[PDB]
């Protein structure tokens, strides 16, 4: 057997056993850590990341919390659903996971697009499902094609998403890794180059690149403008803001969101009447939970421990 | 006080008392009829219709069923949500209503767009929520801007939706009823002229015309192609097909869906592995549950009684 | 030197010498045949076809006409212009070619998309530039994403355009010919399979597949609805209608346009006040000028000879 | 007779007589000033402006130049063309006007969208038609829905265009001036409030508000990205940059383009190899040719005199 991303037979073992749940349209794959009597935490990966993006952080959080880490649809061992990728479908999948698996109020932490989905749940979950959310370096506004504030996706991560769409393809239908690496290495985007490797990185083998299409094309959030979601949050919010800057050659955003976009997000969430904490860590990498797990967990724990 | 659709102070009493539930993002208004110990039924109105579209049919269905009739978001007394109107948000609202209010498996019946939503639930609800669905004159394919089969919305109901968008406006921000009636009276679409009246009909006063925009502009179902939904239904389906035809002047569809679209929908649901029933009533009006309630209830009851 | 479509060094000699003209934004490549004192004819190829699609027909037409055959932008040796492909840019290129090279009124004949452009010139050229147009098997309506009448591109040639977009790519940026042939051979579209070959056909090597993208995505004609263009033609029109049918498995259109779309196009052009000739040749292939050159030239000549 | 913008019977006399030319698809209305033997100048108004936007500046320019001022399609007495409004159609109209009416090389000056069109001609006219262009406060990038650099239209003039689309409507099909003024008066955009008046201003009565739609919806320039146009200019360019700033409440752009967008435009034109002049007049109103005609003409003349 020659395995392939398109055939979805690429998965490998990890430090925690995996479980699956039927949510109706999809099956969600996930893993669990910690004492089930301790407060529940739901971890949402960044785009291209599976649940095991949190593997090291899970071991540290297990000191105090009952942790669930999930594969979103289009990722990992969860269902791939051509033509169905939207913030509302990702979000409602997570509402169902809470109702069907967790069965208790949760603290949610999500990285990047996962942090956009953490804010989505704060605003749009079923009543009483959430105690608070941590949005770890989220591209508020900057992941939209037509944002209310600041740089668009085409002026931020879009160059990478375009390469994923063109060289990898929906459901890995093209799979031209050599052409991806050629184009990426010649790109003006540093982030594009960070995926260049001899072989396809494991997390990307598990990723449905239709995700990149719906971000690039502005369809993933067409029915979910960020200004309305942010102004309707209903729980405490912790917003962590990592490296960010401007590329001189193009004017494009480096990092997840600009200082302007973070300010506007903070004002909107304040107007919603919730408690907002903002932690600027301008020296931290995008996936702090992976590059500096102890630092991430200390931030999360100090904040979560004071919730309820 | 001069009431106005834009101010949402236009509602009037009906034959059943009204109840409200917080679903999280929205509050949903609904009414209930019948003995709660009898099998549960959920009624979904047509576009521009409130729960009381079913008032007469509810009284007859109360003989054998426990009936819930709902206002969708953007209609009636349920929340209006600018920029959030999509099949997935309407559908997940209904999933939450079943989980939080009904708390038992349901038979779903929906008219027109409501029948599109009934099929949505058959495919995409949470597991075990549904016993079967009735799709009463549903615009499968014909309500999509880019359908896989047959006439597009622009070749069907689009002329009416365009007039709602232009003369009534999102959240009734324009409210030019006189201009609507002038334009509708000169239209080639009989359906358009069917809304012309001296005053605004009560049901339309309760309707958020952003609904019409998202149908006309192809955004309401952008992340929910009908061919994928219909191929993923998981319950028995009854499809009723009322008046339909072709306007010789324009070639446009008259009615909810063509024979070709009904055939393609039936084949897709058959390939999903469910029991499909098809009842053609070519002399029936679009809202049979309103114009011929006894006939509608006989069809529904005969089919529902044979379910489980 | 290893030549490549993306490097645009693939061209070969043909039976006529080639010439180039600066039209401003682009350089147009073309070839000329016949006695320059005889009536001028401009030949527009089908999509993926270069000027030499007409090579055999040119020799026959030279008996009576002064023939120019052109490469459109994105084709052949004419400029490739990323992000600029639209009916209005193709059309205005041709207006400039007439004004700068031909310098006399012309009879225009175009195949498929070239026939759409022949109708465009009939409606939208500069005054007095045209004596008449032949639209050879044109996808009126059927090449639009949202047509006023009949099947959309997604229900016609779209499956082929999708494969060109995904496996060949804008400006041949992907160039996965093996993957194209694999996907095409498994396609339900007979036309997709007609491009399958051991090596890339010469005409396709010269083609910028961004053309297929703008057709598939509905941008090429977004500012040029066919119902308005057809109702504004200003010259005699000959419309030839070749093989057409319906695929039983999918309901999709086979051929360039349906009988319904041809009828509606004929009515619109009649309403414009012009002379319309309609030649149904239901046994002819799509590129009659190439598969049956003598038959094509006899049709063109009988009609052109009676113009002016 | 009760005149109405929708009926296009609202025009009035001006200080110069008006002339019309058939350009093919459209008829273009224009006025002429000065000695025909002097160097030719073509004046392009701002959006919502007719040729007589330049009436005072024409009288001063007549001292040294032969001046043509035009109504674009969708404005003034030139044809209204539903569904056809795009930069490429406006631009090719102007190419035809130069070829059919002026018949000599021209210096072009255009305000706002007209300055976008002046750059369009510099890049895309027929060869030899232009000696140079002046772009008077042009919304480079800022009038695009998805620009390569800086604020989008939704973050700039979009609020005004949205009000034109909703309360005036395509071809003045809604015509709700009272509702426009109510909405415009409550808007955050000063530019919106600048159109509020007891009666409809004369220039707006001549304007087809479908213009506003195609700017707001991102279709007018979909096939004409500004970064490609600006990188392909072929004549000297003068860019005047008037009042601009940031609204602290919203973050939105005030004025035609930001400093960042002006810089990126200058660099692109420099890379095209032309002479670029940039005149910042940060105290000037948007239509300097109207509010300070003598200053506008001094800038234009000083620069034009140094051309050829």
Author numbering:
A (entry chain A), B (entry chain B), C (entry chain A), D (entry chain B): 1 to 308
What does the paper say about this structure?
Zearalenone (ZEN) is a mycoestrogenic polyketide produced by Fusarium graminearum and other phytopathogenic members of the genus Fusarium. ZenA cleaves zearalenone [ZEN, (S,E)-14,16-dihydroxy-3-methyl-3,4,5,6,9,10-hexahydro-1H-benzo[c]oxacyclotetradecine-1,7(8H)-dione] to hydrolyzed zearalenone [HZEN, (S,E)-2,4-dihydroxy-6-(10-hydroxy-6-oxoundec-1-en-1-yl)benzoic acid], which decarboxylates spontaneously to decarboxylated hydrolyzed zearalenone [DHZEN, (S,E)-1-(3,5-dihydroxyphenyl)-10-hydroxyundec-1-en-6-one]. Furthermore, we report site-directed mutagenesis as well as structural analysis of the dimeric ZenARe of R. erythropolis and the more thermostable, tetrameric ZenAScfl of Streptomyces coelicoflavus with and without bound ligands. The X-ray crystal structures not only revealed canonical features of α/β hydrolases with a cap domain including a Ser-His-Asp catalytic triad but also unusual features including an uncommon oxyanion hole motif and a peripheral, short antiparallel β-sheet involved in tetramer interactions.
The ZenAScfl tetramer is a dimer of dimers, and its subunits display canonical features of the α/β hydrolase fold. This twisted β-sheet is sandwiched between two α-helices (A and F) on the front side and four α-helices (B, C, D, and E) on the back side. Notably, ZenAScfl features a β-sheet formed by two short, antiparallel strands linked by a tight turn between β-strand 7 and α-helix E, which protrudes from the α/β hydrolase core and touches the left side of the cap domain. We nicknamed this peculiar β-sheet, the “flake”. The catalytic triad of ZenAScfl is located in negatively charged cavities opposite the dimer interface and is composed of Ser-112, Asp-137, and His-286. The structure of ZenAScfl confirmed conserved His-286 in the loop between β-strand 8 and α-helix F as the catalytic histidine, at a distance of 2.9 Å between NE2 and OG of Ser-112. The crystal structure showed Asp-137 OD2 positioned at a distance of 2.7 Å from ND1 of the catalytic His-286. The backbone amides NH of Ser-113 and Gln-47 are in positions that suggest their functional role as hydrogen bond donors of the oxyanion hole of ZenAScfl.
